[PDB]
Design a protein around this nucleic acid. Structure first.
Lengths: 72, 72
DNA sequence: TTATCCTCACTAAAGGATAA
DNA sequence: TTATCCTCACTAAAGGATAA
């Protein structure tokens, strides 16, 4: 159930949920994509100033992609 | 036709296309959402270090939302 | 119309690491 | 395991603005 997302907080919460559902650690994702674990922690908790690059890398680590859609 | 997106560049290119297709100026979107036109120009051309907050605001201006999906 | 410029205050992310 | 800390180099984004 991938819902429409409207903010960095909503985005981070959804992505964290995917990580937890799959039983992945922050450290293991971070290693896979070559970024700091600390960076993933910052994304999950403090997403607003997170870069697009960090977001896409994490998305890849989670075996996810994204699409645009209508706001409704 | 909203396709899967895998990078900041792909994301920016898709969003610019929506703006152009609708005939919107950078200046008008920027006004609507209270950010600089320069910021929108930076997003479209240099998206990699753009913040999640900027991305979501622009998405709103474009009458768009986003969802997660499988990478495939 | 939009890429581009100046300045300033702030932050992300890298390097490194810790507690419990 | 993950939130959190230090440092440093870099940038985004705000304020302001321009050319043509």
């Amino acid at each position: 159930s991938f819902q429409k997302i409207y903010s960095p907080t909503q985005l981070a919460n959804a992505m964290k949920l995917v990580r937890q559902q799959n039983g992945w650690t922050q450290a293991e994702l971070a290693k896979k994509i070559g970024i700091k674990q600390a960076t993933i922690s910052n994304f999950e908790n403090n997403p607003d100033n997170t870069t697009l690059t960090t977001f896409f890398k994490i998305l890849q680590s989670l075996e996810l992609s994204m699409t645009l859609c209508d706001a409704k």
